Amino acid sequence: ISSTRLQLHRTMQAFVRALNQKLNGTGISAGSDKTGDVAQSGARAIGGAEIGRARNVNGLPVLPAIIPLSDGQTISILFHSPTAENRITNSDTLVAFQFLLNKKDVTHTVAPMSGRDMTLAQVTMKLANLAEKNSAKFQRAQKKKKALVDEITQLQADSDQKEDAMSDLADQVAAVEGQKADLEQKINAVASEADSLYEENERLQGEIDRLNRTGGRD
Amino acid sequence: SNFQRLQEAKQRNAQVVAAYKSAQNSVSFNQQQITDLRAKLDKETGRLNNEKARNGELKRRLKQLKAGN
Incomplete structure (x- = not known):
């Protein structure tokens, strides 16, 4: 041509x-x-x-x-x-x-x-x-592409902000757990002391009655 | 492709919001239970106090009794 x-x-x-x-x-x-x-x-x-x-x-x-x-x-x-x-x-x-x-x-x-x-x-x-x-x-x-860009940017910003907020909760839980363990130990110690003291008291009360039966060995 | 980006963004979004809710409730929960533990400890201490007083009184009465034969 x-x-x-x-x-x-x-x-x-x-x-x-x-x-x-x-x-x-x-x-x-x-x-x-x-x-x-x-x-x-x-x-x-x-x-x-x-x-x-x-x-x-x-x-x-x-x-x-x-x-x-x-x-x-x-x-x-x-x-x-x-x-x-x-x-x-x-x-x-x-x-x-x-x-x-x-x-x-x-x-x-x-x-x-x-x-x-x-x-x-x-x-x-x-x-x-x-x-x-x-x-x-x-x-x-082109309009759908621009809308995609705008929405993905907004959503990603949302997720990042939320994760930044999330971060420290595990450490908070860890501190709580430590305090819980300490409380459990305290309770156990107190209960053990109490029961041992009760046994001692019962033995002493038995001895008291036995000795008062005769009047302190005359 | 932006479509895979949609997939990942929305799945991470749902994951993060679920984590946020659970981790927000945890703090109220653990405050409640630590208060409960404090209460239990105080109750047990009261009972121990009573037992110690009884033990002391009973031992003193014994020492009064046996002295001098």
């Missing part, structure tokens, strides 16, 4: 313009916030998509084109060079085959091969429709 560098940028800006023109009804818009660099030179294609560094999947050239849409979603189309080998170089026809929406492969429905031909309007409308369908859940996911 396109050259590596001599046709990629123009086709991408035209594609972005078509998407923007036909995505008018939905609040979603497509574009890039990137504006070149610090140097401010004229003849600048500010609006459009972005191109990433080439990679190699299984020995074949791989060249990405990322279209960052509003609302937090993205659309990425992928090129490869069958006519040229080794590096991508320049001035080399490229083939658009893979279409990705939010990292999930979706080429399977957007681009069946049918009648040995295909138009672009179907592609554009199809991607617009899937983007506007997916946006709802893609948006609720």
